[PDB]
Symmetry: D2
Subunit: 295 residues, 4 copies
Amino acid sequence: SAVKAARYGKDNVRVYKVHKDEKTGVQTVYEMTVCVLLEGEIETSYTKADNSVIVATDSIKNTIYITAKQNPVTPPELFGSILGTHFIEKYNHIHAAHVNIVCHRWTRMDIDGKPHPHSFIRDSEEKRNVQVDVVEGKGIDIKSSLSGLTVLKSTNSQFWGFLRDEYTTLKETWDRILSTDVDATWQWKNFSGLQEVRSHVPKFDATWATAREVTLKTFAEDNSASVQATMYKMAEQILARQQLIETVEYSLPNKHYFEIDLSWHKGLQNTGKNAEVFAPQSDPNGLIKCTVGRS
Amino acid sequence: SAVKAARYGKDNVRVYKVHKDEKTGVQTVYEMTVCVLLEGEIETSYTKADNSVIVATDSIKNTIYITAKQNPVTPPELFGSILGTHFIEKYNHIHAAHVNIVCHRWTRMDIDGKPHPHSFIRDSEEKRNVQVDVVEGKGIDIKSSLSGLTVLKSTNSQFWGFLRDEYTTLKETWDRILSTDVDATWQWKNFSGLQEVRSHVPKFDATWATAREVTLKTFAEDNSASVQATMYKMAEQILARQQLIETVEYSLPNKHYFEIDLSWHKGLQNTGKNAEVFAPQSDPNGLIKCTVGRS
Amino acid sequence: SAVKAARYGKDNVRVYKVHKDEKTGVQTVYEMTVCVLLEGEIETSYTKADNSVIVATDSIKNTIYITAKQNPVTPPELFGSILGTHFIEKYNHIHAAHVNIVCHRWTRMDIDGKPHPHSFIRDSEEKRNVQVDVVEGKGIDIKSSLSGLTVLKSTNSQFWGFLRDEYTTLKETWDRILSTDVDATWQWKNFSGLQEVRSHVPKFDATWATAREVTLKTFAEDNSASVQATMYKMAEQILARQQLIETVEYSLPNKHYFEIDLSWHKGLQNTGKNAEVFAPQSDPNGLIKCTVGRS
Amino acid sequence: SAVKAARYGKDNVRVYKVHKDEKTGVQTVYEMTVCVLLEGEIETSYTKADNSVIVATDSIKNTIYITAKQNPVTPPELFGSILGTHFIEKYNHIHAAHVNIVCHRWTRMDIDGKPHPHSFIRDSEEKRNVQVDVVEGKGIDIKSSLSGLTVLKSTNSQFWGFLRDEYTTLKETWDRILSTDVDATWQWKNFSGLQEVRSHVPKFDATWATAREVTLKTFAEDNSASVQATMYKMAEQILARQQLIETVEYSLPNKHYFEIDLSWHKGLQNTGKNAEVFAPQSDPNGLIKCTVGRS
Ligand SMILES: O=c1[nH]c(=O)c2[nH]c([N+](=O)[O-])nc2[nH]1
Ligand SMILES: O=c1[nH]c(=O)c2[nH]c([N+](=O)[O-])nc2[nH]1
Ligand SMILES: O=c1[nH]c(=O)c2[nH]c([N+](=O)[O-])nc2[nH]1
Ligand SMILES: O=c1[nH]c(=O)c2[nH]c([N+](=O)[O-])nc2[nH]1
Ligand code: NA
Ligand code: NA
Ligand code: NA
Ligand code: NA
């Protein structure tokens, strides 16, 4: 036998950081969950019980905290790049570092209509994420995403004209509910190293904002022919607004809301134009995926 | 043997309802999860296999949908009361109906700064809930609550002066992080029936708003001596602002954020005044509860 | 305002303990999650910022570990009683201790048909739990339970003869699937203190075994008229086999498995006697509860 | 813009099937969760609102049920292959079908020491899974796995000899707890189509059994130098016992159990040889991965 691939490290490392402005007394918080997995000349830890090649996962944890103490943790694309670069530079025999970061929302509270200097609310489980792969000799590959953005529109969604055969029971519709949990990923041009990442730092928050904005406005305004057709419109716009992105990927569940026929009870009319009460379906769910690039 | 208590029904019933304004084309959505459990002269279904006394749980489900079709689903205190009253009035041998409702957030989107007529976002897993107990002969008992309201303040929390003995290791602190998930319940005066609930309908949305407002402002502004002391201030204010509430109950976890001593590494200073990076602790957690009534 | 009720403490305390037999080298492990909440003369911590009355939740945590070091952690009824008694005896102003314990399964592995001396498997998320309320002046109240015991029978379940009216659509059936997650609780006679708990120690493991045994055999063998009728048979038998239990409570979801009519496709017959493929329903679910005492 | 990749279908489809032996009255149940995602000449559904190319996800659902009615659902490698083959053969423009199956445990109960003909228990959340990729022109690629197999050993685990530098605080140990959730995957030789899968049907249950057996025995018996070294031994043995597997992949968290120093309390000795009570850590966790192939 032989090792064909191997990576190891520390997962589920929770990290908080606070910034305190001395002049103003305004505090800002950041919270994330970090995973760092390393690759390199480590195969003998598996095949020969040779632990000398192992940077202990506890030491990886410590390094995450130390790196957060010594550097900005925002934007997460930057933090991830600093962190991954550290491992491949510090350790001769480590040749790749795979950094995943989940950013949690802590939005400043407004109290009596004024922003509070040190109080925050979790306004949803929507996450902002990065996957940063720092590979010796091959730069830094970054995938940025937003996830857990849960939306619903109550009309201006359709689904008709699909293939019909002996497996088909679904009725065509010209007016349905559409709800989803948005998972959207933009894949950056390869960066040659940490300096090139640094050179683009403002583009990370701006592109996340654009992606979110485009997603919400297109979802709200598209008189949707399908999840397929709507998500493609989102991706095309994001590509048109950031040249340093190569692809945009969406993964969208169709979280079904079924009509409830109540005509068996006192002739109640609750279908078609009279539909008011629906049964949200937990499972199953359609799942629609696309990766969009430039022509 | 003998039945000492029994209740049965349908849990986890997901319900959506849409309202469409003909004049304006503005749509409004509501979504909930409903549980209805019945009590009455039903013991023989347990002891003698006598199903004649059972209103099938599937029929309870149907009734939930029908009731939602024929009535407003908001405020949930009202809907719950209508629903519970139905069962004790329709069925001679059913003498109590226990209705729990979880309301899910669907907040109207603002697109390009204008509210959208039919598009919504789940801005957090914060819930608004009711527990409505409709008991034949004894009116309607309602507990209203908000839950899953997750907050953090980065300073203006203290904890010192606690009991110290041979079990104590915790250091006193004059400046710590405080984070919690707020579960707040206001218990209404008993209502004599559905008419009295109806008579108070505007008070339900107003009292939920007050409770939320008081919670957030007191959390943000209190230079907190303890979770105990802060939650009591919240409860006292809510009681002072709605005479028809008898008690306010809080259940608050203390979601700990631990300092990380990094002085072992290059003499890094990350404790006390220099504390910037912290380790959020998933477990264990303090749990602090209070029920506050009037003097 | 005034405090009407208050309790506070530490939740979600994970605890492992190992026993090592010197003679034999056989190791045995125990793992639990513990919550301890205290009541007493603590109201001034809420109303007057007086922390002097607070046994810190961190100290409660420490005490859990210390108590586990100095005492058997099994049966959990005993451990819980020792732990709760400690708090009301150690602290004059603490008058009740509420101890909840969740026991996790670590079943010894059999390797090559022989039990292994120090290797274990989690054979399900079924839990064994206790709720121990130690109240100064009023002894020790214990509720023991098993939960998360998930079972299915593929026939010998019926449901017919239920009430039929204008809300009813459910078809009567003489042969259906029955599946549930068993939550069964036996409530002990009040104990006057820790000595009386000690005096009954063998009865705790024996009664848990009986409850589990009765549950499984009655579920498997009862040609069930309803969940109501089957759960009552379980409760009656457990009461008949342990005189020191006062009541047995069951809480059982009916986790529905729906037939799928496929006759629209090539006349496939998949209903009634020909039913082979079913759709398990995640929600909604019937919920059936009973508390059984002695006549 | 242009579509670079696209797949769509139905996720989270719950499926039960029962087999009834007429001769004997012995019933056997199977339960799974299925996802089917299709690829093909479908890009115009995204770019041009052309739904004519869409096999509706509801029809995919129906097809899953129909296929389960007409074929064995075990072993899941076979069922998955039948299902995926159907889609690429039935639809000219569909060129790949990606089938994921999660199999849930329903183990026959033994009652009074005899196996019951129609009653079952969920003995853990351990799953048996397949990923079956049926690609037109390129056969059938199958990855089989077991997951959620949670184990603990209380001794005969070590971790010393790892790299030590200025980021390192972890103490070397010669006797620690090791616990993990086993995720093990065996990747089959490419199959040319459904006939070749059929030809190997007995090997699927046998290889799953071997993988489970090897995993448990090696975990229990290895005086472990590291998770790395132990998991490699498991993989090598599985490869040696099934020539039709090309690689074995493990993904193992190190679910840490920390010592608790209690010497601050009455000089209690709970570390090293005296360690009895430990704190299980929910997060963070080491994460160790390997893909092993043949030399
Ligand atoms: O937008 C949609 N795309 C699909 O591919 C689809 N398939 C189904 N369906 O049959 O339920 N609804 C759908 N809605
Ligand atoms: O506000 C608090 N109340 C408490 O009762 C408490 N106990 C502990 N503690 O020891 O960690 N922190 C606490 N903080
Ligand atoms: O055992 C049962 N008890 C019930 O009370 C019940 N109600 C319904 N039902 O209508 O679905 N099934 C049921 N099955
Ligand atoms: O088996 C192990 N492998 C590792 O790579 C490792 N790293 C750490 N650690 O530092 O905690 N424990 C570990 N245990
Ligand atoms: Na390197
Ligand atoms: Na009645
Ligand atoms: Na006391
Ligand atoms: Na094809």
